Amino acid sequence: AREAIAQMKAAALAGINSRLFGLDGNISTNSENTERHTA
Amino acid sequence: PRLQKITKKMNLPTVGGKIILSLDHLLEYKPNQVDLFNTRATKTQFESWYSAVKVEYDLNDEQMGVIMNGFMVWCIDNGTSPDVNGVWVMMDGEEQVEYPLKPIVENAKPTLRQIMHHFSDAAEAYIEMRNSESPYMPRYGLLRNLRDRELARYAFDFYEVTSKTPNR
Amino acid sequence: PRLQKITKKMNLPTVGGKIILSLDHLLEYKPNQVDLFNTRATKTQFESWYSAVKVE
Amino acid sequence: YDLNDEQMGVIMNGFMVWCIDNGTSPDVNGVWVMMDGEEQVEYPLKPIVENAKPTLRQIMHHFSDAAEAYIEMRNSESPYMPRYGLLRNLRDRELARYAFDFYEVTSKTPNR
Amino acid sequence: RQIMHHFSDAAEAYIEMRNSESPYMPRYGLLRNLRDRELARYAFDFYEVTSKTPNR
RNA sequence: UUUUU
RNA sequence: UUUUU
RNA sequence: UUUUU
RNA sequence: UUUUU
RNA sequence: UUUUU
Secondary structure, eight states: OHHHHHHHHHHTOOSOOOOSBOOOSOOOSSOOOOOOOOO | OOOOSSOTTSOOOOSSSSOOSSOSOGGGOOOOGGGGOSSSOOHHHHHHHHHHHHHHHTOOSTTHHHHHHHHHHHHHHSOOOSOOOSEEEOOSTTOOOEEEOHHHHHTOSSOSHHHHTSOSHHHHHHHHHHHHHSOOOOHHHHTTOBOOGGGGGGOOSSOOOOSSSOOO | OOOOSSOTTSOOOOSSSSOOSSOSOGGGOOOOGGGGOSSSOOHHHHHHHHHHHHHO | OOOOSTTHHHHHHHHHHHHHHSOOOSOOOSOEEOOSTTOOOEEOOHHHHHTOSSOSHHHHTSOSHHHHHHHHHHHHHSOOOOHHHHTTOOOOGGGGGGOOSSOOOOSSSOOO | OTTTTSOSHHHHHHHHHHHHHSOOOOHHHHTTOOOOGGGGGGOOSSOOOOSSSOOO
16 A cells, blocks of 8 residues: 555646745836826 | 965065055954945944934833834835834734834934845844745735745845845 | 743844843744734724625 | 763663654754653753754764664564654564664665 | 966865865856856856866 | 765 | 746 | 946 | 935 | 725
């Protein structure tokens, strides 16, 4: 049975790419403006 | 037969034909490495920060150890940058005893993190045991979505690299 | 033989040559984590919100 | 650990058995444990590793004959095998003697 | 640096022995994340190539 | 030499 | 060590 | 040749 | 060196 | 930190 177990564990895991990062929360698509308006 | 690592006959600087500059007394010169960087503040500035803060809270008592400790946990779970405002808080029992926020920052001679690299092993052991009991993770990590529960040890704003860390 | 996680001989802050700042009484300091964030309001503001609404 | 006492012999011994039954690599975290009676008296894990001047196994090749005799007698009574072997599925019960992370080859071993 | 290329063998032997005792690495390396602990010998701002070095 | 969870 | 619906 | 914080 | 909310 | 109708 020691063989058959390892065959199961290996058969049920393939293609799963770990990729320890998820996604970052910090977005900056465009920097902050910091300018004014007048008439 | 035995000898020492450096020898006078090694090639060395030669300003004068006779006199050598690097005096061979280095065999006992072993300062702890981390104390020498630039990314850490001085021994002086850390001291004055600890003295100047005490007046503006006006404690003059050893409750300061609690207040300092009450700061570092909050210093984990939210960012560290000069653009903070509002308040901060530690809790006891079930209430939310708060405090002000300004004088810690503005009476910080270089920037904040430039002081707070001292706290490396303290918070390390802290999240270690809290991870031992229950599955802990800070906010600085959850905001950036790590999958490996194991590397909570290395999630801070303030964390000082050394030659001791692993290559992972 | 048994001991505790933190030890006094751990490397720690050294303002004075003698006195240590982080007093070793942290072995029982286990606040519920979520109560400590900034993204949540305070216990105070939640209370006043519940009181001020009732009048209006 | 701040012991300054000859309990160190027990703690050292309590490490090597655990050092068998799980891997040895710098990427360990958490805790480790020995037991007495029926409880699970645990300890921390960091300072053994980080205060290891070269890497860990580079120290632990000293322990060769100790753990050897250890698993020999435990195999004598009952059918023992570590985890480092069961993770790699040996069929011959007899070669448990040569299953470690740390094991130092010599000119004495057989050719099998 | 145009002055400090003189110091080549001094700092070399220095980090050699400190690496002998304990696992030393400078900041110029840790900022650039080497994996091989062995090549701390060749991590400086100032280091003067010669015909003596190996091809690694 | 390192890299065996 | 994690990852087996 | 300079430019490596 | 700074800049991580 | 804000900004999710």
